[PDB]
């Protein structure tokens, strides 16, 4: 369904009796603005509206028993909400007041956003696999999808930029409300009578989406203390999402934690096909001691290739299960998993940690 703004509304019954509402800003993610703006915007979403402040909306939401978060993804900026079915008219209205008329007060920028954003960036980058994945996106998709997912002080952002990003995005065409456990008619009525009805149909002065421009054969190395990690990244067209989900599930995927898979026989190894609107990245990562990772990444590379077509076909059902597990309300997924062969020769490589030990790309 849609309203005059062209705000898509989708609703479907849920299992657990929670109306897990969610708003997906199509291209307000880390790919659109300058590096890290989407993270700060996400940190501003639920603080201070024109209707209810942070200390009021949070207190009421907790009283109403719901949970709310704003997570940044390279494609879209997601505002997730979860509440009991009777509580829809409240949260939806609040969500409207979040997309429109968010205050962006400098005191919230310097007290609750920059501190929180920096803390989350430091916490996430402490995991060598996550920082390796960020570098792999950086070197595979030079711009857009490769922009760092989190704010970094290396690219200073001022509150004016964050506010201008909230505007110039969040337009009617640019947002999609998706709910699980809410009647589509009732949700459409609430959205029509909420603040969503006031957003502009399209952003006048921004949202000029750039081409993906996938780049292959590159490599990078990011020295780190503690645990090391070696990653291999295959860029994939959207139409190939099926071939690699089968490959990943064939060798072992983060979505499906299970021994007995070829990639699980080596410590700390995993694989995962990050899926985006216009491109994807199949990442095979190994983590742990630098000495272990050195041979683990080479073994994982040799496992990804030389995977029997019979086992690859047998893994189709595991891939279907993995896709169904990933298809959360926040990130709808429609990938047809075919057993087709998936090449690996076009890999980018990233090393993190004890660079004196980790292998180079020419060593695979």
């Amino acid at each position: 369904s849609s309203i005059p703004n062209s705000v898509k509304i989708a609703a479907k019954e849920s299992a657990t009796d929670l109306t897990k509402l969610s708003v997906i800003i199509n291209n307000a993610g880390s790919k659109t603005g300058k590096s890290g703006v989407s993270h700060l915007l996400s940190k501003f979403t639920f603080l201070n509206n024109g209707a209810k402040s942070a200390l009021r909306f949070t207190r009421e939401s907790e009283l109403l028993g719901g949970t709310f978060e704003s997570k940044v993804t390279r494609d879209a900026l997601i505002l997730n909400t979860t509440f009991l079915k009777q509580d829809l008219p409240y949260y939806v209205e609040a969500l409207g007041n979040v997309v429109s008329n968010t205050q962006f007060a400098p005191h919230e920028f310097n007290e609750i956003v920059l501190p929180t954003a920096n803390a989350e960036t430091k916490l996430a980058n402490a995991n060598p696999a996550f920082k390796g994945v960020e570098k792999l996106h950086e070197i595979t998709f030079r711009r857009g999808l490769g922009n760092p997912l989190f704010y970094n002080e290396s690219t200073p952002i001022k509150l004016e930029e964050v506010a201008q990003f909230s505007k110039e995005q969040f337009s009617g065409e640019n947002i999609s409300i998706v709910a699980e456990g809410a009647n589509e008619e009732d949700l459409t009525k609430f959205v029509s009578e909420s603040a969503f009805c006031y957003l502009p149909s399209s952003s006048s002065n921004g949202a000029k989406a750039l081409p993906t421009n996938t780049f292959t054969g590159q490599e990078a190395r990011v020295p780190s203390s503690g645990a090391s990690s070696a990653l291999i990244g295959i860029p994939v067209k959207p139409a190939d999402f099926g071939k690699y989900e089968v490959l990943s599930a064939a060798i072992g995927t983060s979505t499906l934690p299970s021994t007995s898979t070829p990639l699980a026989q080596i410590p700390g190894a995993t694989s995962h096909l990050y899926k985006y609107q216009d491109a994807g990245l199949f990442v095979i990562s190994v983590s742990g001691e630098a000495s272990q990772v050195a041979q683990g990444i080479k073994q994982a590379k040799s496992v990804a290739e030389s995977v029997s077509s019979s086992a690859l076909s047998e893994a189709v059902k595991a891939a279907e299960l993995s896709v169904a597990l990933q298809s959360t309300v926040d990130s709808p997924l429609n990938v047809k998993v075919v057993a087709e062969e998936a090449p690996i020769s076009k890999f980018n490589y990233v090393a993190v940690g004890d660079l004196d030990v980790l292998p180079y790309a020419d060593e695979l």
């Binding site: 849920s14 299992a15 929670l18 942070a54 009283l63 979860t82 499906l256 934690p257 189709v316």
Partner: protein, 416 residues
């Protein structure tokens, strides 16, 4: 929906057409609580061996819980029946599978997991808390055993464990997702063949207020956990204990909502940033439980202040909790229960846990009705009964030099 097959095994399924993915799992009770020090971790090792078998396109995983163990075969909806047969086979050939198995790799993996829970500070803290609280009984043993005992396990011990615990009276087939229950029951009936036997007696356990301090000054924070004898799955105060815990709820200092969270403890602890994070929990076993909080303090000079303020807020439970806090806690507990039961894997695990440990599973609507009935006076009665002036169990890992001795924290439990 329940059906007692031949052999007396019960298939319990919670089917819902909206489920994204289906799951089915055989759980045979007798977790670590059924083990003893010499053979600790054998249940987890056996379940890992069983779940390491060929998956035939499904997703086999082990459970390895404190009081029950099982193998769960997650799979897309249409494939569920196949997964059914799979697990049935995996359990009809359990002794054969264990006999033909070279445990070296599986024991290495289990010891790796045991070290993992010995390195993740929260896992270490709660494992030590449970061990000290129920010290002297099998319930004190780790779910995954210790890195010393695992290497001492052999195939024969696993076979003995299976023969004792993998019996019809002590097993349940849980399932969830979108499928016809009758089809799954029929598919399992033709394939499930497990030995007869009486349900093993569940070993006793009694809470003993104690304190354990693994002080490691090299860590960056102080990971402490303080609890009291809680409510097991049996107790009618189960949901009441959850509400009492939720009254104080969670907290993370760097979370955006940190300055706005309802709980009074949260507002108290930003004034000097006493604590980095904490979370109140009501862990519930078959007949006993642990109700308390876990906390990570960054500033090593404020452990005492945090413990003081948290135990004062606990004192507030039996006296001055207002209707607003009780209403918030009820709503948050209802939402948390609904969240825990969204994933079909989680629903399968919960079905197995309840059917094995309490015999009957209260539907989510019944749980909501039972939580809604709670009044503030009920919560205060529970606080007087189980919290006010009651023994506490303490655990700490690093930089806990500031964590004062047992008497100070214990006496904080009864001052006004």
């Amino acid at each position: 929906k329940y059906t007692t097959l031949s052999n007396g095994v019960t298939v319990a399924t919670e089917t819902n057409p909206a489920a994204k993915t289906s799951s089915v799992g055989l759980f045979f009770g007798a977790g670590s609580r059924s083990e003893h020090s010499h053979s600790n971790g054998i249940s987890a090792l056996t379940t890992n061996v069983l779940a390491s078998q060929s998956a035939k396109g499904s997703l086999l995983t082990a459970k390895n819980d404190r009081e029950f163990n099982g193998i769960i075969a997650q799979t897309t909806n249409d494939n569920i029946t196949e997964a059914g047969k799979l697990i049935a086979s995996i359990a009809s050939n359990a002794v054969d599978i264990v006999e033909k198995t070279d445990l070296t790799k599986h024991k290495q993996y289990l010891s790796a997991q045991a070290s993992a829970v010995e390195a993740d500070p929260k896992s270490k803290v709660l494992s030590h808390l449970y061990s000290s609280a129920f010290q002297g009984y099998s319930l004190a043993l780790p779910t995954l055993g210790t890195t010393e005992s695992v290497e001492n396990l052999e195939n024969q011990d696993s076979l003995r464990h299976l023969a004792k615990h993998l019996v019809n009276n002590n097993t349940v087939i849980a399932a969830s997702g979108n499928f016809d229950h009758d089809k799954l029951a029929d598919a399992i009936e033709a394939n499930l063949k497990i030995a007869e036997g009486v349900k093993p007696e569940i070993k006793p356990a009694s809470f003993l207020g104690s304190e354990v301090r693994m002080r490691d000054d090299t860590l960056p924070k102080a990971y402490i956990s303080i609890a009291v004898h809680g409510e097991g799955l049996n107790s009618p105060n189960y949901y009441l204990a959850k509400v009492a815990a939720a009254i104080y709820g969670d907290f993370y200092l760097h979370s955006t909502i940190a300055k706005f969270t309802s709980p009074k403890l949260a507002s108290i602890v930003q004034e000097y940033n006493i604590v980095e994070s904490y979370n109140h929990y009501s862990k519930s076993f078959s007949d006993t439980g642990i109700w308390g909080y876990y906390a990570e303090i960054a500033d090593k000079f404020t452990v005492d202040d945090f413990t003081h303020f948290s135990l004062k807020e606990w004192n507030r439970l039996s006296i001055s909790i207002s209707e607003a806090e009780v209403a918030r806690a009820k709503a948050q507990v209802k939402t948390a229960l609904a969240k825990e039961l969204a994933n079909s894997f989680a629903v399968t695990s919960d079905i197995a846990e309840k059917v094995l440990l309490v015999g009957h599973r209260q539907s989510l609507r019944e749980a909501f009705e039972k939580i809604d009935a709670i009044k503030v006076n009920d919560v205060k009665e529970w606080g007087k009964s189980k919290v006010w002036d009651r023994d506490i169990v303490i655990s700490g890992t690093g930089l806990i030099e500031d964590l004062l001795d047992y008497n100070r924290n214990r006496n904080e439990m009864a001052m006004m």
